[PDB]
Design an enzyme around this catalytic site. Structure first.
Site, PDB file in Angstrom:
ATOM      1  N   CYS D  90      31.128  90.014  19.335  1.00  0.00           N
ATOM      2  CA  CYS D  90      31.176  90.713  18.046  1.00  0.00           C
ATOM      3  C   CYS D  90      30.975  89.757  16.896  1.00  0.00           C
ATOM      4  O   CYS D  90      30.543  90.162  15.808  1.00  0.00           O
ATOM      5  CB  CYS D  90      32.536  91.380  17.870  1.00  0.00           C
ATOM      6  N   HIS D 348      28.763  99.044  13.064  1.00  0.00           N
ATOM      7  CA  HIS D 348      29.080  97.780  13.731  1.00  0.00           C
ATOM      8  C   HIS D 348      28.056  97.444  14.818  1.00  0.00           C
ATOM      9  O   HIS D 348      28.360  97.483  16.011  1.00  0.00           O
ATOM     10  CB  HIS D 348      30.499  97.846  14.293  1.00  0.00           C
ATOM     11  N   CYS D 378      36.872  89.847  14.156  1.00  0.00           N
ATOM     12  CA  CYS D 378      37.467  89.751  15.473  1.00  0.00           C
ATOM     13  C   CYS D 378      36.383  89.897  16.526  1.00  0.00           C
ATOM     14  O   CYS D 378      35.319  90.473  16.283  1.00  0.00           O
ATOM     15  CB  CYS D 378      38.519  90.828  15.698  1.00  0.00           C
TER      16      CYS D 378
END
Lengths: 391, 391, 391, 391
Positions: D90, D348, D378
């Site tokens: 991520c 995202h 994160c």
């Protein structure tokens, strides 16, 4: 030798590719027409069915491992009912009719189901397994929807052309112009739509619960100009289009077939007698005229000629293909060839089509109060089947 | 109705899974036995073949799209030779004999090929298509090698059990002991190895060039000790092992079938007459005994009893299955069963097996100077086929 | 700028494609070299590792989702240890060295691991998903083992040629003959075998428990004659063979990298200082010479010339590629290149190679009691990386 | 230690999963933002870019084989422009900023591109390869869209829980209520909708020709009630829903990053200076709080505390995650967090997010005439990245 009768013929409306039945597994489509057959004939105890034949041109997907047998089980029929699945590609549904016909004719069966089913929508991919571990190269994930796959290198290339390419050659060879194709395609939509609207198919239709169709989904209100505007699908200068070719479709059909004894058992007056059958094969690259000789054979075995026919069900894989068959046969009265339309409009779920056109031939002969009917279907890789009915 | 004869019967040696035939596409296996039939019968003009019937339990792989037709084209046969592929799973090869038998018996054909082919090695993967774009989760790539795949959620769970699990159930139910199974499996290997060594199979064998096999590859030199030592395959406490179950195999078999006119045309003395056949279906979880009624039906139709049989080919899906069939046929002498061994040792390429055992039954009756023969084969989803031969 | 040292460097033996490490998941390969680094430095507290960099040219398989972090977790290392995976294709292992080197040089880290890993054996297939439901055509199942895949239509076709094809062009362009390439390949095998035999790689090798390799699996006892007999792999008239190209291999390498503070903390005397690095990029179709400018950059940044090097580790993607780099580095003495062999014999598990050659350069410099070393690696889409070490 | 600046920051709008960008290959997404960086700075000679870094959490599909390089080539940048792809899941897009930052800070580069790209719509399937020929059982075809795949049996189960499940535990552990998450989610949508309407993203947006987006496609006109109505996505009793979790998204982001000399060379006034960065890793099952230490480290490296920050870009993987981070940053005023919304609303696309939030922070800082900014993200297997900017 025992006379053999179509006791009943039923079929789902045909869904278009990715359309209204694309959510229905092919084994469920087959199971459904079996359910419908049992529903339609309360005198039919399914346990009396000696064998269930299903044509299925694919079977790699959810209809795998003998869909006829699976279908009988799924339809809630006794496990004592056998089932066999037959693949003569596009003609498989008529092969199953013939197979059941023969089983009864020889006395191996009194009562049989001949179905056909295709879910071309849910035609899966097939991935060959490597012969050795850690294959390094890119593989082809073959779609089973359409055309050749996993082609044998030794197979003559001229035979592995697409059905459309083959039919272009047949159209060129037999002088089937784009306009005649589109005229034939238009008529298919016109008659299929009219037949639906006038209730002609009510006798032969079972609706899938939750997936009802007002008519075969590929039927359109179209027009000569609409068809004339389509681009050729197989050659830049081609004549075959999506409008004068059959669609890819989903659907199932099933015929209840018995001898005279089974007819009374089941409590049903035969729609028609299956008199004769014919099979022929041709060079794969002219598969569309596959049925020409098959129909001749069937007619001869029936002891009749073209003039004796009051209905011809010539499966419309392509307008060009059907027209080429008609060009090789004596002139048939246009009104009798696919009087209620054909696969161009109704759809061509391969395994189902050959059963459908026999079944609807039988219903049509019943509507006409008797007569000789011919059903003929071309097959990919160059085959043809024909069935002669008589009411 | 015309008498129907097995004019010739040929097969490849059967390769074990991933074994000596695992590099041969199933359409090529089928084409080979067709080529072998034509080589074997110099009076056979392949144009005389009216139809080619091939049993094939799979067909998702290289044998896709009607392997019977593919095979005939690949064999160099005229494009006029039609082909149809039949699926009655493990009985497909015998279904195809029966199909051919019926076609000739009704006069739709005079000369036909009934073959069976399976490449269980090259059984591909099948990947269903997503109904919607960009599916998100992990998918199952189904192997078509064995067992159930893309199982219908409505299919009764009890019917989807593995063939071995079902046979364990049948073993328990009929008291087929582990030692009894292994004795039957041992006998299969001994008789098959002896038949090979004594030339018994030379009458029916065609070698694949570049893939020759000294004998059926699954045949082992084995012993009661080796068999009893094997771990159970389907239950921790089970009786079925890799040793008393048929293998997975690759092979093809093909029978030249004709009426008297065909026999004269082809210039071949019938090995045997196809007298009758039966089909039966049972609960899928007792598929192993599926042949029982089918044999009874076939015997009844042939006008004979078990005492009249001089050879029985009971296909050896599992020793337990086979032994259960014999128990339910009390009148049958078990020592005339599979005199040259069976599928436990010879191999069980599903589609070919039912053809092989009819073909080898015919050869056996030829070796014995005549007599009544029964071939019977259980089918996986609860079915059975039987053919009665008389020389 | 903070001085940065190679504190340790370890690697597995490299397995050949489908060879001794083909059963080891790449994340396990990576985790193993992490475990080995931890075992090899008793003063190393893995929690002290600020970041774990792994080069990995694939990552589609079991090394997916940041193998560096995965490997740290699988290695039993504290969850506090971050990990990042880097893809500069064939040079990824050198990229991670440089990445770690930069992190420490700027003070973002004091102690880092720079690894590379590739399981080319276990390089999976990739199947793109359909954008719509019920896709129709045959799809490509892309092997990630080698070459371009899922090729962008807009990518210039000249750049998507295979590495071997590109290197054939480079070999032609720079007059690198087949005999020259085989000599360099022979040299690689001889030096690699000799290095192993003399224990030169003992300092850098960790063995996978249960998958131990006597030496790098691709090392063979070969000869000018064997190499000359080899058929060209990329053109009928080509010069690249399987013998003068690197293999496809599996393997992992990992370097413990730290500043002086790390070195003291870990209790390791630096093998070598990482003085400088270079990156360059060229036309993808001359990727073989991608390192040429990268090395010049690294040399310039180190303040040294080709004169000053005592060891050069030039990754041997292809003999012809390496020889072309040498021709374009005329001041480089070819003799000092790959003294212990290179990837032709040792293998070329893409991600691992660039780390391996940096690690083995450090060890070699260590063996030699110091000096300047250059490691350089060509990269598949036209790039090159170089690192100058000094002990 | 050279000062390093964000000279420009651009991104595509983010399309939702299966949405407006789902037809754009990820390498074209990356290539697009490169073309936009070139178009946006006419003083930029792309050949002056020393390295192109792209974060990409997948890379299995069309972005395979080092999408950063592929993108440079597809953008028509000189083949001399190198490229490297980075995977810290991520956080990859922020990793790539950090990677470029470090390259320039040490003098290896003057001008770099740090990008991030993800097409989660087009995340392909991967099929592990058989280690042996003719595999027999069904296989898993892994989707790369979300979560773990090809899971190492040795990976602790605790670490392989889904991201949602982990954030549920984190939300439980830190007392993050459904309402608090939905308020944060609502706010993300409100601020992102408002930022788009007021033109706030116009400075950083590049539209994809033919795939234009009025705003980030996952932004919705929603409400506290609609969010409260959503059912929990990961536990029956859960607080995480599709509404308080980021979506899956497609997009690309790219920052032009340079030292002062690069700034003058491209003719661009810096948006912000990259001051410091942090990395931290935590237990995988609390990955949501991965950034916590990463931000502390970065602040302490920048010489500042929370008080000094005028903007914080905290990537919104989950509201609960984001709120737990805030909870663990007690000195952080939550109102300066994501002033223009965040990933819950903007989307995202893993690899793109870390680049986008750095880029947006640079623009926001520019928009406010200077200040200290923090970007934190994160990362799925328990990591976190943080970047401190200052204008």
């Amino acid at each position: 030798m025992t006379d053999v009768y179509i006791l009943d013929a039923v079929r789902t409306p045909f869904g278009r590719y990715g359309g209204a039945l694309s959510g229905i597994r092919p084994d469920d489509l087959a199971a459904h027409v079996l359910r419908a057959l049992a529903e339609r004939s309360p005198g039919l105890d399914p346990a009396a069915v000696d064998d269930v034949f299903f044509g299925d041109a694919n079977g790699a997907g959810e209809d795998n491992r003998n869909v006829a047998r699976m279908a009988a089980l799924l339809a809630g029929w006794p496990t004592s009912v056998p089932g066999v699945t037959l693949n003569r590609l596009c003609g498989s549904g008529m092969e199953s009719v013939i197979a059941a016909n023969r089983a009864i004719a020889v006395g191996d069966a009194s009562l049989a189901v001949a179905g056909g089913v295709e879910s071309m929508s849910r035609a899966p991919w097939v991935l060959p397994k490597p012969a050795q571990g850690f294959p390094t190269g890119h593989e082809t994930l073959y779609s089973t929807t359409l055309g050749w796959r996993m082609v044998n290198p030794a197979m003559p290339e001229q035979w592995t052309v697409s059905l459309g390419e083959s039919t272009e050659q047949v159209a060129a060879t037999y002088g089937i112009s784009r306009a005649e194709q589109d005229a034939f395609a238009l008529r298919s939509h016109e008659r299929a739509a009219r037949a639906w609207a006038e209730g002609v198919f009510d006798a032969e239709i079972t609706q899938i619960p939750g997936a009802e169709l007002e008519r075969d989904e590929s039927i359109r209100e179209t027009s000569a100009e609409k068809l004339a505007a389509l681009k050729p699908a197989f050659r830049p200068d081609g004549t075959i289009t999506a409008g004068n070719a059959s669609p890819l479709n989903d659907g199932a059909a099933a015929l209840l077939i018995g001898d005279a004894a089974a007819a009374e058992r089941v409590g049903r007056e035969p729609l028609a007698r299956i008199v004769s059958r014919g099979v022929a094969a041709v060079d794969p690259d002219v598969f569309g005229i596959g049925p020409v000789q098959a129909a001749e054979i069937a007619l001869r075995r029936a002891g009749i000629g073209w003039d004796d026919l009051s209905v011809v069900e010539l499966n419309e894989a392509f307008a060009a293909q059907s027209l080429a068959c008609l060009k090789l046969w004596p002139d048939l009265d246009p009104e009798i060839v696919n009087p209620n339309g054909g696969a161009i409009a109704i759809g061509h779920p391969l395994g189902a089509s050959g059963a459908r056109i026999v079944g609807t031939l039988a219903h049509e002969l019943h509507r006409r109060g008797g007569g000789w009917g011919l059903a003929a279907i071309c097959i990919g890789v160059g085959q043809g089947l024909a069935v002669v009915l008589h009411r």
